[PDB]
Amino acid sequence: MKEGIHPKLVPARIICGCGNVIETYSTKPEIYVEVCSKCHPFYTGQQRFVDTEGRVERFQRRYGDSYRKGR
Amino acid sequence: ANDIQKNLSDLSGGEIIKLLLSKMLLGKYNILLMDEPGNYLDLKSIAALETMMKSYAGTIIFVSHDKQLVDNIADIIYEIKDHKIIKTFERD
Amino acid sequence: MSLIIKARNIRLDYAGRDVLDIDELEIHSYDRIGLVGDNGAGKSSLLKVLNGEIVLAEATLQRFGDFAHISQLGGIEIETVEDRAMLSRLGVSNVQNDTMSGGEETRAKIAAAFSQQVHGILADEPTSHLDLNGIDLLIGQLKAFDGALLVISHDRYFLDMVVDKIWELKDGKITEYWGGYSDYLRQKEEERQHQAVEY
Amino acid sequence: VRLKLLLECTECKRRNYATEKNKRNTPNKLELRKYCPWCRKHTVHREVK
Amino acid sequence: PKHGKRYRALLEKVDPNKIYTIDEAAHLVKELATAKFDETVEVHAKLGIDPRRSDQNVRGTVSLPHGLGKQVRVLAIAKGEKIKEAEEAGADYVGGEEIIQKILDGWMDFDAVVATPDVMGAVGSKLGRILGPRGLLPNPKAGTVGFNIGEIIREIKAGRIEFRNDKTGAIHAPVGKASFPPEKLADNIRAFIRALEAHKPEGAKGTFLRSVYVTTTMGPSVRINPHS
RNA sequence: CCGGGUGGGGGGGAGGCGCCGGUGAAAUACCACCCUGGCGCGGCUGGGGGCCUAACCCUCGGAUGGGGGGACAGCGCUUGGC
RNA sequence: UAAGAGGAGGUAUAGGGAGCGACGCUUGCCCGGUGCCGGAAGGUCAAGGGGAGGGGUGCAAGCCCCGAACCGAAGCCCCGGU
């Protein structure tokens, strides 16, 4: 795997399908779509000190790795 | 033709002038004494009135508002400046 | 700009044809809506309903702002105050009720129109029969007092000086667009150049 | 159905209607007649819709 | 500049910065209003209402059992035995339909009117054109029309007053002298609070009991809060 | 909207108006909570414009040295239109 | 499939796409429609920012759902070009 994280692991996927909106007022909404898709996380690149690595995902910067550079 | 049966009370409200204007254009006359023709007539009816009043047989007068029938139909503009000074004219 | 009225589902059939079409109307404060056009739209009939001249027996109107009124066909009964307040430099003063005829009482039937937090004006013709001095004595002071309106008239002399946006109904159309140049934006008849590039 | 209408008359005291036809042009004056509802009195209804 | 007034040493003492109480500023106004002849205190309040809406236009009174003196000039509208009760009780101006006809003629000397219900149809029809919305008019549940007119005047010498909020909500209560005791007229202003909140209508939004101030009518005085 | 009010600095060497008098629909001072009012104070802004550099982008015969770019762009979820 | 590779270790007298096909004489008239480019200023329209007012229960403070005055792009309409 090379879209996992170092403190977590996330490669998910979905399907998608679109129709109408008018539902409490009118007939019902149409449904003519079904297409499989994919829904990626965020890439990051970082450097702190003697310059290693890490690729965390956009909300575990302020939560995750500042403890491990607080040792 | 739809609405030829209505009372006076519940009428156009402002169309009275249009109905009264046609009443005097029937009947055999020589001099007309009109006070504000074009009271509630908006623009399209006041365009209808301004095309006849320079094409008339006898003489007419009109004692009305300024600026749209004056210097287009008017020929002598009498004016009462002070108390009782009706001699004062405008426009020839 | 809080609301006043939320009139909905208004329709009238006096002469067979529809006076008013199905709507859901709305007026709030800080507004100066003018009205225009037509010869038999009953814009004054319509005006009657907002004040409370009639009932419709179908509508579920609500109102909490109190209004004024100016009629279109009539005079008015006696309001004679001792040691007179703001009519000595305003239009006509105390006069007998036998001479009042013409552009003498239009300033008197609006002389009751300036009182008591009146929060809006429902006019139907302000400037009947009154000439140039009564114009500048109206428009100089009609713009004074704040609040929502709905003044309706027949020529854009003072209607360009005071109005921010203008309505026009053509069998109940509640189109709304910005005032002064309403006889200049009605060249959407020119986008009916189709029929001459489509046939 | 150009000039004819589907009108639906209600009471001078109460609820729902009694479903008839009208012309809208040669009469105009908001018709009214007399009928027997399900409260048994033979009252007069009015053109309400 | 700095114009200079006799009220300069007065408002070195009443510095308008803190929210003064009844009792602290009451003893302060005891020593403060110590110019020429005795102060006549009338605590006003300006209520945060829409007074042109008559569902929230409120007035009333409460009966305050204390000794008092020169304040509200009250027309008693009454007939014979109620008139004798009022004249024993200490009425400023007594009367009935005759004095109704007198104020209809030309004579004004009163601030409040109380009326006995035997002639109240005449006081409600006849007195409207001159009394009006001035602070003077009859009201049925505002301590104005009622059979206890003797109790109204008998207490006036100790307590009674009567509300009316004028244009923006301005309402009065006689609650003091140039140094009157505090407890007493403190009881006066506490039951003023109780009666105001008793005839408090539903239309409260925000600070209903909005603003509180002893302006009196015309002369020397500075304001008061009735909370403490 | 004539007069004048509103606000400061004066030329210094018992003083003026306010009381009284006056006048009439009110009468002279002056403290007035909170409301209408137009200028200011601590500031305040959806949006628009400047340069700076400890995010990152691209390149420098040994490259946290140096010199650029600059919070653009690139990238992730998401609305509308070809 | 994100990295990467051909363009090219080339830099507008170079590189992609479309059409007529040496040489000689020449390639006229239309911008109404369609496509492409340049648009001052304005007309409609999406999520999002907002909270006027109204609805359900509860001893009450409160907790739940609609909501719309105004502000918010590309594309279209309108005005000129080829």
Ligand SMILES: Nc1ncnc2c1ncn2[C@@H]1O[C@H](COP(=O)(O)OP(=O)(O)NP(=O)(O)O)[C@@H](O)[C@H]1O
């Ligand atoms: N009560 C009524 N009875 C009969 N017809 C009516 C009534 N009210 C309105 N109408 C009709 O509806 C139309 C509009 O009425 P009206 O109120 O006069 O329009 P308006 O907007 O006032 N225009 P104007 O007449 O020029 O002031 C008229 O042409 C009438 O024929």
Ligand SMILES: Nc1ncnc2c1ncn2[C@@H]1O[C@H](COP(=O)(O)OP(=O)(O)NP(=O)(O)O)[C@@H](O)[C@H]1O
């Ligand atoms: N019954 C009457 N008694 C006395 N004077 C009268 C009477 N009727 C009319 N007048 C006079 O006529 C005048 C009224 O105006 P009028 O003579 O109608 O001119 P007008 O231009 O029609 N008025 P307007 O159009 O309202 O500006 C007054 O100045 C009176 O002196």
